[PDB]
mmCIF file of C-alpha atoms and ligand atoms in Angstrom:
data_model
loop_
_atom_site.group_PDB
_atom_site.id
_atom_site.type_symbol
_atom_site.label_atom_id
_atom_site.label_comp_id
_atom_site.label_asym_id
_atom_site.label_seq_id
_atom_site.Cartn_x
_atom_site.Cartn_y
_atom_site.Cartn_z
ATOM 1 C CA UNK A 1 111.978 105.141 88.439
ATOM 2 C CA UNK A 2 109.022 102.996 87.262
ATOM 3 C CA UNK A 3 106.377 101.984 89.864
ATOM 4 C CA UNK A 4 107.747 99.105 91.952
ATOM 5 C CA UNK A 5 105.821 96.227 90.269
ATOM 6 C CA UNK A 6 106.593 97.648 86.833
ATOM 7 C CA UNK A 7 110.343 97.741 87.642
ATOM 8 C CA UNK A 8 110.068 94.226 89.080
ATOM 9 C CA UNK A 9 108.432 92.964 85.810
ATOM 10 C CA UNK A 10 111.143 94.699 83.715
ATOM 11 C CA UNK A 11 113.764 92.956 85.911
ATOM 12 C CA UNK A 12 112.235 89.511 85.319
ATOM 13 C CA UNK A 13 112.057 90.125 81.586
ATOM 14 C CA UNK A 14 115.647 91.355 81.405
ATOM 15 C CA UNK A 15 117.016 88.620 83.719
ATOM 16 C CA UNK A 16 114.924 85.778 82.389
ATOM 17 C CA UNK A 17 114.655 84.846 86.083
ATOM 18 C CA UNK A 18 112.178 85.182 89.046
ATOM 19 C CA UNK A 19 112.186 88.050 91.449
ATOM 20 C CA UNK A 20 110.540 87.695 94.894
ATOM 21 C CA UNK A 21 109.756 90.726 96.901
ATOM 22 C CA UNK A 22 107.965 91.996 100.009
ATOM 23 C CA UNK A 23 107.835 95.321 101.786
ATOM 24 C CA UNK A 24 106.386 95.133 105.319
ATOM 25 C CA UNK A 25 106.074 97.507 108.229
ATOM 26 C CA UNK A 26 108.440 96.284 111.088
ATOM 27 C CA UNK A 27 106.154 97.527 113.846
ATOM 28 C CA UNK A 28 102.900 95.835 112.752
ATOM 29 C CA UNK A 29 103.579 93.514 109.876
ATOM 30 C CA UNK A 30 101.375 95.516 107.489
ATOM 31 C CA UNK A 31 102.229 94.408 103.922
ATOM 32 C CA UNK A 32 102.757 97.452 101.703
ATOM 33 C CA UNK A 33 103.588 95.646 98.448
ATOM 34 C CA UNK A 34 104.633 92.148 97.387
ATOM 35 C CA UNK A 35 105.524 90.062 94.347
ATOM 36 C CA UNK A 36 105.792 86.257 94.351
ATOM 37 C CA UNK A 37 105.885 86.658 98.063
ATOM 38 C CA UNK A 38 104.645 83.043 98.698
ATOM 39 C CA UNK A 39 107.046 81.406 96.184
ATOM 40 C CA UNK A 40 110.194 79.681 97.335
ATOM 41 C CA UNK A 41 113.665 81.196 96.883
ATOM 42 C CA UNK A 42 117.111 80.021 98.103
ATOM 43 C CA UNK A 43 118.051 81.963 101.190
ATOM 44 C CA UNK A 44 121.801 81.870 100.706
ATOM 45 C CA UNK A 45 123.567 83.959 103.363
ATOM 46 C CA UNK A 46 120.451 85.686 104.371
ATOM 47 C CA UNK A 47 119.870 82.727 106.594
ATOM 48 C CA UNK A 48 122.769 83.946 108.850
ATOM 49 C CA UNK A 49 120.387 86.591 110.439
ATOM 50 C CA UNK A 50 117.847 83.845 111.426
ATOM 51 C CA UNK A 51 120.736 81.633 112.631
ATOM 52 C CA UNK A 52 121.960 84.415 115.035
ATOM 53 C CA UNK A 53 118.309 84.913 116.164
ATOM 54 C CA UNK A 54 118.348 81.251 117.264
ATOM 55 C CA UNK A 55 121.743 81.853 118.981
ATOM 56 C CA UNK A 56 120.346 84.901 120.843
ATOM 57 C CA UNK A 57 117.352 82.688 121.824
ATOM 58 C CA UNK A 58 119.777 80.215 123.451
ATOM 59 C CA UNK A 59 121.497 83.115 125.273
ATOM 60 C CA UNK A 60 118.163 84.343 126.598
ATOM 61 C CA UNK A 61 117.331 80.742 127.735
ATOM 62 C CA UNK A 62 120.659 80.590 129.653
ATOM 63 C CA UNK A 63 122.093 77.888 127.289
ATOM 64 C CA UNK A 64 124.656 80.146 125.623
ATOM 65 C CA UNK A 65 126.754 83.258 126.156
ATOM 66 C CA UNK A 66 127.856 85.756 123.597
ATOM 67 C CA UNK A 67 131.107 85.927 125.560
ATOM 68 C CA UNK A 68 131.866 82.146 125.297
ATOM 69 C CA UNK A 69 135.073 81.715 123.293
ATOM 70 C CA UNK A 70 135.093 78.892 120.777
ATOM 71 C CA UNK A 71 138.476 77.468 119.736
ATOM 72 C CA UNK A 72 138.272 75.690 116.318
ATOM 73 C CA UNK A 73 140.656 74.192 113.855
ATOM 74 C CA UNK A 74 141.769 74.712 110.166
ATOM 75 C CA UNK A 75 139.987 71.446 109.221
ATOM 76 C CA UNK A 76 136.733 73.191 110.292
ATOM 77 C CA UNK A 77 136.967 75.840 107.704
ATOM 78 C CA UNK A 78 135.084 76.274 104.485
ATOM 79 C CA UNK A 79 135.665 78.909 101.787
ATOM 80 C CA UNK A 80 134.740 82.618 102.129
ATOM 81 C CA UNK A 81 135.735 82.865 105.820
ATOM 82 C CA UNK A 82 137.727 86.091 105.942
ATOM 83 C CA UNK A 83 137.428 86.614 109.692
ATOM 84 C CA UNK A 84 137.411 83.149 111.155
ATOM 85 C CA UNK A 85 140.472 82.080 109.201
ATOM 86 C CA UNK A 86 142.416 84.789 111.071
ATOM 87 C CA UNK A 87 141.714 83.223 114.558
ATOM 88 C CA UNK A 88 142.874 79.629 114.426
ATOM 89 C CA UNK A 89 145.196 80.311 117.396
ATOM 90 C CA UNK A 90 143.049 82.539 119.565
ATOM 91 C CA UNK A 91 139.443 81.486 118.659
ATOM 92 C CA UNK A 92 136.320 83.648 118.533
ATOM 93 C CA UNK A 93 133.505 84.444 120.974
ATOM 94 C CA UNK A 94 129.960 83.390 120.046
ATOM 95 C CA UNK A 95 129.093 87.154 119.568
ATOM 96 C CA UNK A 96 132.151 87.661 117.393
ATOM 97 C CA UNK A 97 131.092 84.676 115.284
ATOM 98 C CA UNK A 98 127.645 86.163 114.748
ATOM 99 C CA UNK A 99 129.165 89.517 113.882
ATOM 100 C CA UNK A 100 131.502 87.797 111.326
ATOM 101 C CA UNK A 101 128.633 85.727 109.971
ATOM 102 C CA UNK A 102 126.285 88.670 109.538
ATOM 103 C CA UNK A 103 128.649 91.585 108.725
ATOM 104 C CA UNK A 104 131.272 89.689 106.621
ATOM 105 C CA UNK A 105 129.147 86.754 105.550
ATOM 106 C CA UNK A 106 131.792 84.478 107.152
ATOM 107 C CA UNK A 107 130.868 80.976 106.170
ATOM 108 C CA UNK A 108 132.915 79.017 108.829
ATOM 109 C CA UNK A 109 131.552 81.280 111.493
ATOM 110 C CA UNK A 110 128.037 80.453 110.325
ATOM 111 C CA UNK A 111 128.900 76.705 110.322
ATOM 112 C CA UNK A 112 130.300 76.820 113.839
ATOM 113 C CA UNK A 113 127.186 78.727 115.033
ATOM 114 C CA UNK A 114 124.992 76.224 113.149
ATOM 115 C CA UNK A 115 126.339 73.344 115.108
ATOM 116 C CA UNK A 116 125.537 75.110 118.440
ATOM 117 C CA UNK A 117 121.848 75.286 117.465
ATOM 118 C CA UNK A 118 121.609 71.615 116.421
ATOM 119 C CA UNK A 119 122.588 71.936 112.725
ATOM 120 C CA UNK A 120 120.242 72.758 109.774
ATOM 121 C CA UNK A 121 117.599 70.487 111.419
ATOM 122 C CA UNK A 122 117.848 72.441 114.721
ATOM 123 C CA UNK A 123 117.527 75.768 113.040
ATOM 124 C CA UNK A 124 114.471 74.493 111.180
ATOM 125 C CA UNK A 125 113.022 73.372 114.477
ATOM 126 C CA UNK A 126 113.559 76.804 115.871
ATOM 127 C CA UNK A 127 111.815 78.344 112.836
ATOM 128 C CA UNK A 128 108.750 76.047 113.428
ATOM 129 C CA UNK A 129 108.837 77.126 117.137
ATOM 130 C CA UNK A 130 108.481 80.776 116.175
ATOM 131 C CA UNK A 131 105.565 79.874 113.790
ATOM 132 C CA UNK A 132 107.504 79.853 110.490
ATOM 133 C CA UNK A 133 106.268 76.648 108.812
ATOM 134 C CA UNK A 134 107.776 77.420 105.435
ATOM 135 C CA UNK A 135 111.481 78.376 105.816
ATOM 136 C CA UNK A 136 113.810 75.391 105.980
ATOM 137 C CA UNK A 137 117.608 74.937 106.221
ATOM 138 C CA UNK A 138 118.896 71.542 105.155
ATOM 139 C CA UNK A 139 122.571 72.009 104.411
ATOM 140 C CA UNK A 140 125.699 73.717 105.709
ATOM 141 C CA UNK A 141 127.861 76.347 104.000
ATOM 142 C CA UNK A 142 128.691 76.351 101.189
ATOM 143 C CA UNK A 143 126.451 73.587 99.736
ATOM 144 C CA UNK A 144 123.321 75.448 100.862
ATOM 145 C CA UNK A 145 123.957 77.907 98.023
ATOM 146 C CA UNK A 146 123.460 75.299 95.253
ATOM 147 C CA UNK A 147 120.110 76.691 94.175
ATOM 148 C CA UNK A 148 118.795 73.720 92.148
ATOM 149 C CA UNK A 149 115.471 74.207 90.343
ATOM 150 C CA UNK A 150 112.682 72.178 92.002
ATOM 151 C CA UNK A 151 114.617 71.860 95.192
ATOM 152 C CA UNK A 152 112.995 73.133 98.405
ATOM 153 C CA UNK A 153 116.178 72.623 100.371
ATOM 154 C CA UNK A 154 117.544 75.816 102.096
ATOM 155 C CA UNK A 155 114.629 78.000 100.908
ATOM 156 C CA UNK A 156 112.256 80.611 102.233
ATOM 157 C CA UNK A 157 109.548 82.772 100.821
ATOM 158 C CA UNK A 158 109.622 86.577 100.876
ATOM 159 C CA UNK A 159 106.610 86.672 103.167
ATOM 160 C CA UNK A 160 107.871 84.041 105.562
ATOM 161 C CA UNK A 161 111.341 85.538 105.803
ATOM 162 C CA UNK A 162 109.866 89.047 106.450
ATOM 163 C CA UNK A 163 107.448 87.672 109.088
ATOM 164 C CA UNK A 164 110.340 85.797 110.740
ATOM 165 C CA UNK A 165 112.596 88.724 110.781
ATOM 166 C CA UNK A 166 109.885 90.800 112.259
ATOM 167 C CA UNK A 167 109.304 88.201 115.042
ATOM 168 C CA UNK A 168 113.062 88.182 115.869
ATOM 169 C CA UNK A 169 113.451 91.959 115.840
ATOM 170 C CA UNK A 170 110.271 93.247 117.609
ATOM 171 C CA UNK A 171 107.868 90.576 118.888
ATOM 172 C CA UNK A 172 109.494 90.376 122.327
ATOM 173 C CA UNK A 173 110.277 86.639 121.685
ATOM 174 C CA UNK A 174 113.913 87.650 122.121
ATOM 175 C CA UNK A 175 114.964 89.791 125.062
ATOM 176 C CA UNK A 176 115.246 93.546 124.631
ATOM 177 C CA UNK A 177 119.006 93.288 124.584
ATOM 178 C CA UNK A 178 118.971 90.460 122.094
ATOM 179 C CA UNK A 179 116.618 92.336 119.757
ATOM 180 C CA UNK A 180 118.877 95.257 119.850
ATOM 181 C CA UNK A 181 121.936 93.075 119.197
ATOM 182 C CA UNK A 182 120.478 91.450 116.133
ATOM 183 C CA UNK A 183 119.494 94.867 114.596
ATOM 184 C CA UNK A 184 122.989 96.219 115.333
ATOM 185 C CA UNK A 185 124.678 93.311 113.545
ATOM 186 C CA UNK A 186 122.590 94.160 110.461
ATOM 187 C CA UNK A 187 123.329 97.849 110.868
ATOM 188 C CA UNK A 188 127.012 96.883 110.857
ATOM 189 C CA UNK A 189 127.002 94.857 107.559
ATOM 190 C CA UNK A 190 130.322 95.424 105.766
ATOM 191 C CA UNK A 191 129.572 93.421 102.558
ATOM 192 C CA UNK A 192 126.932 95.713 101.139
ATOM 193 C CA UNK A 193 125.824 98.225 103.846
ATOM 194 C CA UNK A 194 128.421 100.935 103.185
ATOM 195 C CA UNK A 195 127.879 100.815 99.462
ATOM 196 C CA UNK A 196 124.105 100.884 99.754
ATOM 197 C CA UNK A 197 124.261 103.678 102.296
ATOM 198 C CA UNK A 198 126.498 105.848 99.991
ATOM 199 C CA UNK A 199 123.891 105.675 97.140
ATOM 200 C CA UNK A 200 120.717 106.025 99.225
ATOM 201 C CA UNK A 201 119.156 109.471 99.332
ATOM 202 C CA UNK A 202 119.990 111.394 102.542
ATOM 203 C CA UNK A 203 117.707 110.455 105.480
ATOM 204 C CA UNK A 204 117.288 106.794 104.619
ATOM 205 C CA UNK A 205 118.041 104.243 107.364
ATOM 206 C CA UNK A 206 119.732 100.986 106.139
ATOM 207 C CA UNK A 207 120.513 97.662 107.874
ATOM 208 C CA UNK A 208 120.961 94.470 105.768
ATOM 209 C CA UNK A 209 122.195 91.019 105.110
ATOM 210 C CA UNK A 210 122.944 89.846 101.501
ATOM 211 C CA UNK A 211 123.325 86.515 99.876
ATOM 212 C CA UNK A 212 124.660 85.007 96.654
ATOM 213 C CA UNK A 213 124.528 81.535 95.234
ATOM 214 C CA UNK A 214 124.495 79.476 92.005
ATOM 215 C CA UNK A 215 122.341 79.846 88.884
ATOM 216 C CA UNK A 216 122.029 83.545 89.402
ATOM 217 C CA UNK A 217 120.724 83.302 93.022
ATOM 218 C CA UNK A 218 121.101 86.669 94.798
ATOM 219 C CA UNK A 219 119.211 88.373 97.586
ATOM 220 C CA UNK A 220 118.975 90.867 100.361
ATOM 221 C CA UNK A 221 117.014 91.203 103.558
ATOM 222 C CA UNK A 222 116.892 94.804 104.797
ATOM 223 C CA UNK A 223 115.495 97.260 107.259
ATOM 224 C CA UNK A 224 114.804 100.515 105.408
ATOM 225 C CA UNK A 225 112.931 103.842 105.909
ATOM 226 C CA UNK A 226 113.007 107.630 105.520
ATOM 227 C CA UNK A 227 113.634 110.001 108.490
ATOM 228 C CA UNK A 228 116.402 107.653 109.794
ATOM 229 C CA UNK A 229 113.941 105.045 110.950
ATOM 230 C CA UNK A 230 114.019 101.250 110.583
ATOM 231 C CA UNK A 231 110.409 101.475 109.286
ATOM 232 C CA UNK A 232 110.036 98.527 106.985
ATOM 233 C CA UNK A 233 111.504 95.161 106.193
ATOM 234 C CA UNK A 234 112.332 94.730 102.471
ATOM 235 C CA UNK A 235 113.166 91.276 101.144
ATOM 236 C CA UNK A 236 114.285 90.877 97.502
ATOM 237 C CA UNK A 237 115.421 87.531 96.036
ATOM 238 C CA UNK A 238 116.446 86.625 92.457
ATOM 239 C CA UNK A 239 116.788 83.103 91.112
ATOM 240 C CA UNK A 240 117.355 81.137 87.961
ATOM 241 C CA UNK A 241 119.021 83.864 85.867
ATOM 242 C CA UNK A 242 122.186 83.496 83.751
ATOM 243 C CA UNK A 243 122.861 87.178 84.380
ATOM 244 C CA UNK A 244 126.243 88.712 85.425
ATOM 245 C CA UNK A 245 126.667 89.469 89.203
ATOM 246 C CA UNK A 246 126.879 93.141 88.152
ATOM 247 C CA UNK A 247 123.452 93.028 86.421
ATOM 248 C CA UNK A 248 121.897 91.152 89.391
ATOM 249 C CA UNK A 249 123.179 93.853 91.730
ATOM 250 C CA UNK A 250 121.892 96.562 89.466
ATOM 251 C CA UNK A 251 118.474 94.878 89.141
ATOM 252 C CA UNK A 252 118.059 94.654 92.943
ATOM 253 C CA UNK A 253 119.237 98.274 93.123
ATOM 254 C CA UNK A 254 116.626 99.326 90.527
ATOM 255 C CA UNK A 255 113.909 97.594 92.416
ATOM 256 C CA UNK A 256 115.063 99.315 95.582
ATOM 257 C CA UNK A 257 115.111 102.679 93.773
ATOM 258 C CA UNK A 258 111.487 102.168 92.679
ATOM 259 C CA UNK A 259 110.386 101.159 96.205
ATOM 260 C CA UNK A 260 112.192 104.200 97.601
ATOM 261 C CA UNK A 261 110.794 106.758 95.094
ATOM 262 C CA UNK A 262 107.261 105.363 95.478
ATOM 263 C CA UNK A 263 107.253 104.832 99.211
ATOM 264 C CA UNK A 264 103.649 104.903 100.420
ATOM 265 C CA UNK A 265 102.503 106.003 103.847
HETATM 266 O O1 MA4 B 1 113.471 111.613 94.390
HETATM 267 C C1 MA4 B 1 113.875 110.571 95.292
HETATM 268 C C2 MA4 B 1 115.374 110.392 95.304
HETATM 269 O O2 MA4 B 1 115.734 110.073 93.949
HETATM 270 C C3 MA4 B 1 117.167 109.830 93.794
HETATM 271 O O3 MA4 B 1 117.603 108.818 94.692
HETATM 272 C C4 MA4 B 1 118.017 107.622 94.034
HETATM 273 C C5 MA4 B 1 119.529 107.329 94.258
HETATM 274 O O4 MA4 B 1 120.236 108.391 93.528
HETATM 275 C C6 MA4 B 1 119.932 105.971 93.803
HETATM 276 O O5 MA4 B 1 121.309 105.766 94.098
HETATM 277 C C7 MA4 B 1 119.083 104.964 94.550
HETATM 278 O O6 MA4 B 1 119.426 103.645 94.106
HETATM 279 C C8 MA4 B 1 118.904 102.633 94.962
HETATM 280 C C9 MA4 B 1 120.000 101.709 95.376
HETATM 281 C C10 MA4 B 1 119.651 101.157 96.823
HETATM 282 C C11 MA4 B 1 120.555 99.862 97.069
HETATM 283 C C12 MA4 B 1 119.714 98.642 96.872
HETATM 284 C C13 MA4 B 1 118.413 98.608 97.704
HETATM 285 C C14 MA4 B 1 118.449 97.312 98.596
HETATM 286 C C15 MA4 B 1 118.543 97.863 100.034
HETATM 287 C C16 MA4 B 1 117.170 98.399 100.588
HETATM 288 C C17 MA4 B 1 116.041 97.400 100.376
HETATM 289 C C18 MA4 B 1 116.425 96.178 99.511
HETATM 290 C C19 MA4 B 1 117.230 96.586 98.333
HETATM 291 O O7 MA4 B 1 117.725 105.148 94.291
HETATM 292 C C20 MA4 B 1 117.198 106.462 94.715
HETATM 293 C C21 MA4 B 1 115.725 106.480 94.199
HETATM 294 O O8 MA4 B 1 115.693 106.750 92.801
HETATM 295 C C22 MA4 B 1 117.922 111.129 94.124
HETATM 296 O O9 MA4 B 1 119.305 110.837 94.030
HETATM 297 C C23 MA4 B 1 117.559 111.664 95.519
HETATM 298 O O10 MA4 B 1 118.082 112.970 95.600
HETATM 299 C C24 MA4 B 1 116.047 111.646 95.765
HETATM 300 O O11 MA4 B 1 115.847 111.926 97.156
HETATM 301 B B1 CZ7 B 2 126.148 83.037 101.429
HETATM 302 O O1 CZ7 B 2 125.401 83.910 100.413
HETATM 303 O O2 CZ7 B 2 125.408 81.753 101.661
HETATM 304 C C1 CZ7 B 2 127.698 82.959 101.088
HETATM 305 N N1 CZ7 B 2 127.762 82.532 99.674
HETATM 306 C C2 CZ7 B 2 128.706 81.706 99.162
HETATM 307 O O3 CZ7 B 2 129.610 81.212 99.902
HETATM 308 C C3 CZ7 B 2 128.655 81.352 97.731
HETATM 309 N N2 CZ7 B 2 129.176 80.108 97.403
HETATM 310 C C4 CZ7 B 2 128.716 79.232 96.464
HETATM 311 O O4 CZ7 B 2 127.631 79.560 95.955
HETATM 312 N N3 CZ7 B 2 129.241 78.077 96.263
HETATM 313 C C5 CZ7 B 2 128.478 77.059 95.682
HETATM 314 C C6 CZ7 B 2 128.732 75.660 95.796
HETATM 315 N N4 CZ7 B 2 129.932 75.278 96.515
HETATM 316 C C7 CZ7 B 2 130.477 74.153 95.895
HETATM 317 C C8 CZ7 B 2 130.661 73.141 97.091
HETATM 318 C C9 CZ7 B 2 130.843 76.288 96.545
HETATM 319 O O5 CZ7 B 2 132.069 76.040 96.369
HETATM 320 C C10 CZ7 B 2 130.413 77.615 96.856
HETATM 321 O O6 CZ7 B 2 131.086 78.328 97.518
HETATM 322 C C11 CZ7 B 2 129.264 82.447 96.963
HETATM 323 C C12 CZ7 B 2 128.489 83.096 95.906
HETATM 324 C C13 CZ7 B 2 129.178 84.116 95.126
HETATM 325 C C14 CZ7 B 2 130.449 84.466 95.399
HETATM 326 O O7 CZ7 B 2 131.128 85.441 94.666
HETATM 327 C C15 CZ7 B 2 131.178 83.843 96.432
HETATM 328 C C16 CZ7 B 2 130.565 82.794 97.150
#
């Protein structure tokens, strides 16, 4: 593989779109490498991890329980809700909703959870409260995927998303059990996790959340490292490319391959 930045440049040239990337140590926040890390990209479903961080903060505060069962209606559903559409009769617990949102990218589960944290504005307030002054959620699923050029709605930057994920996972802002729960949901991703894991070299830890939207928008937030350790956060976003989904997946994979082969100490 080429060096990471060289691969990224190739990807931008081939996609005619922007790539945003950061690789950051989970424990300390040391930035290893970065590209357009301060530029805005649509979060798409990667926001679902931050959402469930906010849910866990409410649990820690005694304002929520992962056990609490929410009964909802067919009228509440939006598209791409493979788990929540199966539970109109019996409902889902708050914990099950977060598992569905993170591991199956379930959109209605995410919207139900979003309401519990005060909607997009409430989630944005939570972000400000943990010192993220950049990331913003403005809309619900699925409109938040629109990815209009010039539109700051529903965007983050690679640097802010990585810093925020680090804060949620390790900064002791969340309780120990909450930190462990958030990581486990990412470990359990079913959308891309198993596929990624199958093509990673032996020994590499993976946990992730992916996203996809309009105008080529595609992304992944991941924990990755050799020796079966969640050593680093890797964030890769793509935007404003007319490329096929297959090519977008392959370009992210190629960037990943370069990062893995040229992993610095
Ligand atoms: O010499 C280093 C390694 O080179 C190859 O590994 C390849 C692998 O065969 C390929 O399948 C993967 O694709 C990378 C696909 C990863 C999935 C996307 C990455 C995501 C998730 C993680 C962070 C964000 C991006 O690259 C590595 C590095 O070349 C060899 O197969 C392996 O034996 C060797 O240990
Ligand atoms: B997550 O990445 O936020 C889940 N992604 C989606 O649900 C994607 N959906 C859309 O991008 N999408 C855009 C606009 N609206 C019009 C109101 C939609 O209908 C809509 O669902 C998504 C992306 C790629 C896919 O193959 C499926 C869904």
